[PDB]
DNA sequence: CACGTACGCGCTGTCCCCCGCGTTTTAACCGCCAAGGGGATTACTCCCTAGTCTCCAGGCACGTGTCAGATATATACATCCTGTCATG
């Protein structure tokens, strides 16, 4: 069970906060380094990485959907 | 060996498109029949060319010898990275 993976993905994206945002590749490598499965739950991450762009907590920098770069909200 | 910039591509995102299904049409298929065109076969007679003795002729073997381009040296651009400034 454990906590839902939204908190895990927020820790993964808040770990670095590069000026050019994290790729989907680098964030799933961070989640795999954390230990969360990224191979069978990649549909769950696939929907989560656009749900988080949609709800406004995180904004997408340069890519589209779950592609490209990502950064935190202004406030 | 070592600094450095770019490369493959992973994964979604998002448009895009082409098979699945099904129907409708239509001429392909079938199958049936008429007819003749030349493929093929036989005949005939004619071209046509390899060979050969010989005879002569040019092209390679070989030597050489002399200037076109290799080599070398001094110049000019290329160009590409670097440096600098206006602007969204």
Q: Which residue has the tokens 């839902």?
A: A4
Task: Round to whole Å and give the CA distance between A19 and A30.
Answer: 17
Tell me the residue range of the domain where A66 lies.
1-75
Interatomic CA–C1' length for residue A48 and nucleotide B83, angstroms: 47
Q: How were these coordinates obtained? A: cryo-EM
Look at chain A and report how many structural domains it folds into. 1
Are A28 and A45 in contact by the 8 Å Cβ rule? The answer is yes
Looking at strand B, which nucleotides approach a protein CB closer than 7 A? 10-14
- Spatial neighbors of A1 by CB under 8 A, at least 6 apart, are none
Tally of CB atoms within 10 A around A38: 17
Structure's resolution in angstroms: 6.4
Closest CA to A68 of A25, A9, A4: A25
Task: Round to whole Å and give the CA distance between A29 and A53.
Answer: 19
Query: From residue A27, how far is each of A6, A32, A36, A42 by CA, in Å?
Result: 13, 9, 11, 12
Q: Verify if strand B has an atom below 7 Å from the CB of A20.
A: no
Are A54 and A9 in contact by the 8 Å Cβ rule? The answer is no
């Amino acid at each position: 069970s454990g906590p839902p993976v939204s908190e895990l993905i927020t820790k993964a994206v808040a770990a670095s906060k590069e000026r050019s945002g994290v790729s989907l590749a680098a964030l799933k490598k961070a989640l795999a380094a954390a230990g969360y499965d990224v191979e069978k739950n990649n549909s769950r991450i696939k929907l989560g990485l656009k749900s988080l762009v949609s709800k406004g907590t995180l904004v997408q920098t340069k890519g589209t959907g779950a592609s490209g770069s990502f950064k935190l909200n202004k406030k």
